[PDB]
Design a protein around this ligand. Structure first.
Ligand code: NDG
Length: 253
């Protein structure tokens, strides 16, 4: 029951900040982890940008932080492919930033003859790119998606995300991803574990997504810490450990 934890995977929008503005207590929270000798790693299923893009956004916000401090379903999806397939020739349904991410992992984008069709939060999607992906899929190419999320919360409200695009791809090719690396797929915790050394026995998930964040911890087997700075109140199914924001979080060590 807490206090014996070493690594805290933190959510970003909805948990650490909101609407591009830090959330009260967030700053003071990290500091508390410093003192109490704790390790923290941010994570987001949003693959429309790469880790660095976020590291910038955080610092530009007022948070000095290392480069390995952020992780995305992007780098997870890449690293996992390299792990079990190696340098791959993929048709990427993603954004320029997501691409650079896959390239840094030695992968290559071959619009011509690819082995995998990879789908990310493609904010640069076009009908043609969809048409191509669908055809390649009907040629039975390995199909991988960075995350499952249907919509993504925004200033203007819920907006189409990877899941929404998937919906179309599936209605057309009748096919669904062969793999999805993002939460709640345990893979995230496993990879984060390896990359930092600390074991699942001393790791905690801190977020605001009642279903996803809680269910991640269940599948990956680690304490899930639900925070109430996001859209949370309705509850059933699985539960976890709870607190309003990081004020409470911090004070609870
Ligand atoms: C009874 C139950 O387990 N669920 C409720 C949920 O419906 C309600 O909206 C919320 C208020 O924040 O409290 C609980 O989570």
């Amino acid at each position: 029951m807490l206090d014996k934890i070493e690594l805290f995977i933190l959510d970003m929008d909805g948990t650490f900040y909101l609407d591009d503005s830090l959330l009260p207590g967030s700053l003071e929270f990290l500091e508390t982890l410093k003192e109490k000798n704790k390790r923290f790693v941010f994570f987001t299923n949003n693959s429309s940008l790469g880790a660095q893009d976020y590291v910038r956004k955080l610092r530009n916000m007022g948070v000095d932080v290392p480069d390995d401090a952020v992780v995305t379903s992007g780098e997870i999806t890449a690293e996992h492919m390299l792990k079990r397939f190696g340098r791959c020739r993929i048709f990427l349904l993603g954004t320029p930033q997501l691409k650079k991410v896959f390239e840094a992992y030695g992968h290559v984008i071959d619009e011509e003859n690819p082995d995998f069709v990879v789908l990310g939060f493609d904010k640069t999607l076009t009908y043609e790119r969809l048409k191509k992906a669908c055809i390649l899929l009907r040629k039975g190419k390995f199909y991988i998606a960075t995350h499952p999320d249907i919509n993504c919360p925004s200033k203007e409200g819920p907006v189409p995300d990877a899941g929404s695009i998937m919906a179309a791809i599936e209605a057309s090719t009748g096919r669904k991803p062969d793999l999805i690396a993002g939460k709640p797929n345990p893979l995230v915790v496993d990879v984060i574990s390896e990359k930092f050394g600390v074991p699942k026995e001393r790791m905690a998930m801190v977020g605001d997504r009642l279903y996803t964040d809680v269910k991640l911890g269940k599948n990956a087997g680690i304490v899930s810490i639900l925070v109430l700075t996001g859209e949370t109140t309705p509850e059933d199914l699985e539960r976890a450990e709870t607190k309003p924001d990081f004020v409470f979080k911090n004070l609870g060590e």
